[PDB]
Amino acid sequence: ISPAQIAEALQGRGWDAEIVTDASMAGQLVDVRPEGILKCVDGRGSDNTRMGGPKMPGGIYAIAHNRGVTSIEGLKQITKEVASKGHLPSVHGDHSSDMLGCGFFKLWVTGRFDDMGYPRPQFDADQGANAVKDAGGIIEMHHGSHTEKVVYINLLANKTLEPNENDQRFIVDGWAADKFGLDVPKFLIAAAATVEMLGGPKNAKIVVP
Numbered sequence: 001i002s003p004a005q006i007a008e009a010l011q012g013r014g015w016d017a018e019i020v021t022d023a024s025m026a027g028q029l030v031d032v033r034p035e036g037i038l039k040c041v042d043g044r045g046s047d048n049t050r051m052g053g054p055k056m057p058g059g060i061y062a063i064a065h066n067r068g069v070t071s072i073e074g075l076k077q078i079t080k081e082v083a084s085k086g087h088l089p090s091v092h093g094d095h096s097s098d099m100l101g102c103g104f105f106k107l108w109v110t111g112r113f114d115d116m117g118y119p120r121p122q123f124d125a126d127q128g129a130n131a132v133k134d135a136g137g138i139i140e141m142h143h144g145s146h147t148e149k150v151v152y153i154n155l156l157a158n159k160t161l162e163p164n165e166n167d168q169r170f171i172v173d174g175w176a177a178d179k180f181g182l183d184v185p186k187f188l189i190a191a192a193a194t195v196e197m198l199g200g201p202k203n204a205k206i207v208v209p
């Protein structure tokens, strides 16, 4: 899927979409390091000590959700997969709703993706986090409130954008979906629906190489 195709797809959902250069984001883009956690698109600050990891809705849940994997066993299998693929697997909560502090997982466990054909997780948020941690994953915990002003869809292979709690944004590493053999158009539609359903800004900036 091309940058123009992504923008066209988002606009079809009523979004504003702009394609931007990687140079315009110089000073913000960082190379991905395998020690970093593959974590959520959430724009808030947190207790993460493993920067440089890719961003996907709900952390590793984006992979389970895209593949329709709903069992705890399937979840542990994806955790190990991610860990064997050069990234530390993670899922998260926050200090306002504990494990329901991840907007993506909450939407998923409450069935907001029902109409898009997704099956529901066969576990609750605490059970999911225990399984990921048991499979060797990292449980992140965010702090503060959501103030994301824009969504960045980064297409630069092996690069990512980091959270800025004082000038928040949602970050989606579109190229990381490819890496995991996901249905990318499907993965991006789900990321857009997540922002939409969380009442976030339907304004995307697509970063291209």
Ligand SMILES: [Zn+2]
Pocket: 040, 041, 042, 057, 058, 059, 092, 101, 102, 103, 104, 105
């Ligand atoms: Zn989240």
